[PDB]
């Protein structure tokens, strides 16, 4: 798999058809479209199953390059859950002027900048997925 691909929706639908054809209830690969909470559980279960196939680097925050007062940033605009598929933020604005306290907080708290401005790391003391030092 290429490093940049992160959608992975039709693959889930095709696996669902290949292995569970005659299951008699709808299945939304992206739980954003679910109805009530019971459909959320029903679809998150299959997502838990299928997400053990795809590469592990393609999970976590989705970042993108935004500008404020002529300065390029790197902030996150969504996620890619192992259970709830892909989620996109609704209120995102490129080209800003100034940031007030609220936005300063939500930008300083993201791991996007911290990880994008750090050295790669390969920790062999563990087996969990490392990210950056």
């Amino acid at each position: 798999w290429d490093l940049l691909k992160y959608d992975f929706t039709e693959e889930r639908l095709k696996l669902f058809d290949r292995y569970f054809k005659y299951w008699d209830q709808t299945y939304h690969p992206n739980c954003v479209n679910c109805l009530d909470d019971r459909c959320i559980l029903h679809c998150a279960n299959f997502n838990v199953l299928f997400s053990t196939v795809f590469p592990p680097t393609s999970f976590g925050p989705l970042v993108r390059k935004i500008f404020v007062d002529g300065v390029p940033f790197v902030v996150s605009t969504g996620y890619h859950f192992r259970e709830l598929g892909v989620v996109h933020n609704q209120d995102v604005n490129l080209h800003s002027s100034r940031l007030s306290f609220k936005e300063l907080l939500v930008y300083a708290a993201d791991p996007a900048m911290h990880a994008a401005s750090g050295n790669l790391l390969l920790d062999k003391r563990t087996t969990c997925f490392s990210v950056a030092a």
Partner: protein
């Protein structure tokens, strides 16, 4: 009354004054942490592009 009610005037003036001093301190440290956050963001950004 002129011996006690004015002491109540004094206590209320003093508590309002102290509260508004502490509020001034709140807004001051507010501006300070704001400056700190933004300088940290800028210096972190200047290492990636």
């Amino acid at each position: 009354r002129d011996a006690a009610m004015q002491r109540k005037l004094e206590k209320m003036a003093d508590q309002a004054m102290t509260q508004m001093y502490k509020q001034a301190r709140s807004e001051d440290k507010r501006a300070k942490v704001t400056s700190a956050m933004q300088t940290m963001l800028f210096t972190m950004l200047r290492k990636l592009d």
